[model samples]
Target: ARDYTVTAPDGVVLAVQEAGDPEGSPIIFIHGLLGSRLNWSKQLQDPRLQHYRLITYDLRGHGLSGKPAEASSYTDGRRWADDLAAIIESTHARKPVLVGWSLGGAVISNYLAAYGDKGIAGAVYVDGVIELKPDQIVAHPEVYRDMIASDLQTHLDGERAFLRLCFHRQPDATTFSLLLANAALASWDMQRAVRSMTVEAAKGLSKAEVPLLLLYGAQDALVKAKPSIARAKSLNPRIRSELYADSGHAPFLEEPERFNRDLSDFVRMALSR
Candidate 1:
């Protein structure tokens, strides 16, 4: 994997990585809350996707990316969108297919709103966050409340619980441990700020002209798959959605084989246009 850092317009440093064929169609994977690029290990190393150029990055407040002490640093969606734009610009990725998971999907929404669909070939939301509304979100009041707690042990346990909610069929010992570590490294201020982070999916998603796919886990404990898809379709009739009957929020990791196939087919179909 080729690793580098791209500085956003706001001067935030983003940790980025690339794999697969350099000349292949570009596919960028954006991870969810409390996640780093490490969350996409399965997709990056997959042999079937070797012919496509794959990229992943640590968002401004997560993983190895820069973390600002001020809460204002993560309060706006445009900042996240700008960070993604910086990566795309630096990589010279033309019309890349964007695959976003959970909060990552929200980033795509902000991107579409701020930058529009001209630079993207297609988009896929894997249990993507369409909104933070109570109807769109499954209520986990206690876990969320503790996530920002002042006590270290309480906060740590909250992070663990949050990670556990990401999968119905939990990952193996090592992977689960690594995911927990990824959570531990996340910035508390960012998580706190994101709760009130603004989203304009109504404008961007409603106005999207590119192919959009929503993939969710049927047994997802965090996101309500049916309503999330319904909400997305309400905004854009052309959007399509599929469910992983056996997985949860993290379908890409829970069922990488099927996720890769769906992604491979979508990339071909989207780029054909």
Candidate 2:
């Protein structure tokens, strides 16, 4: 994998990694809240997906990306969208297929709303947060509160709890530890800011003509999968969906074989359009 740093319009520096066939179709993988590019290790390592150009990046205030001290930097959806735009421009990725997970869904929505679909091929939202509303998300009030707590132990414990909530088929010891460390890199301030992040699916989803697939885990503990899918479809009836029966929040990690095959199929289908 080759590494590069991209600068957003707001001056935030984003760390990016690219793997797989450079000459193949491009795919930008966007990870969720408190997730780093490492979150896509399974997909990045899969031989079946090696035929396409795979791109992954850390969102602002998470992973190796620049963490702004102020809350607005993370709260404003446009900044996140601009960050994705910067990566595409810097990498010279052609209207690549967008694959967003969790908060990554909001990032893609903001990008589509701001930039439109003409520059993209297709999109997929994997267990994505359709909206931050009560109907669309699960109520883990205590977990989120403690995650933003100033006390180090409390914050760490909360983060751990949140991470545990992400899986139905729990990961192995080593992988779980790596994910724990991955969450530890996120900014507490950013977590607080996310509470009010804007999401405009009306402008983005409702208007996008590109083929969109909403892939959800039937047992997702973080986001309300059923309701989220309903909300997403309401915005855009053209969008299609598939539920991963054996997975939870992170289907790509929990069910790699099925996820990779489905993704390959979608990428091929999207590219043909």
Candidate 3:
């Protein structure tokens, strides 16, 4: 894997990691709120995915990237979208597949909303809905509350509980401990600022001429699969949905093998078309 830094137009520096064939198509992986590039470690090493270039970066306010304390940094979706653009520009990738997880979904959606999909080949939403609405938030009240408390108050116990809620079957002691540590590293103020932003669908996604793949965990407590899938399908008729029955919020990690296979198939289809 190769490591580099991408500077957003606003001057925020993002730590990026690249792997796989340089000549192959690019697949940018955007992690959720409080997540780092490390979240995609499993996929980075997958042999099957070596045919394509994989890109993972630390979102602002998380990981090794610059974290500005201003609310404006997290409010405007344009900056987030542009951050991806800068990365692609730096790498000189063409028609890359953008994969978003959790809050990353909104980032990708907002990207398409602001810039359109002219430079994108396809998109994949993993256990997250691109747009988050009030009704959906109401459906999982406790989940949202716990997430806020954990982020805003920096309550270790709350964060631990929140992590458990993210998985169908919680990780083992060692893994859980590591995740807990990583989760705590997120900037609470920035997390709250981002969450406070209004939730809406990306303006052009419903009519965009790009293919989409939606992967959800059947047992996802945070973002329920059924309603989320229904909403995504309602927006775009060309979408394909897959459910990881035994997984939860992090289906990519919970079912890495299946996730890799499905992703490979989706990429192939995108390339063919």
Q: Each model's C-alpha lDDT?
A: 0.93, 0.92, 0.81
Error of 3 at 193 (Å): 0.9
Clashes of each: 0, 0, 0
- How high is each candidate's TM-score? 0.99, 0.98, 0.92
lDDT measured at residue 261 in model 1 versus the true structure, 0 to 100? 94
Give candidate 1 misplaced runs (Cα > 4 Å): none
Record all residue pairs in model 1 with backbone atoms less than 3 Å apart, i.e. clashing: none
Candidate 1 lDDT over residue span 101-187, tens digit each: 999999999999999999999999999999988888989999999988989999999999999999999999999999899889889
lDDT of 3 by residue, 46-131 (tens): 99999899999988888888888898888887777788889988989899999998878878877877778889999998976555
Which candidate do you rate higher for TM-score, 2 or 3? Answer: 2
* lDDT (Cα) of model 1: 0.93
Off by over 4 Å in 2: none
Taking every candidate in turn, the Cα RMSD to the unseen true structure, in Å, is 0.7, 0.8, 2.1
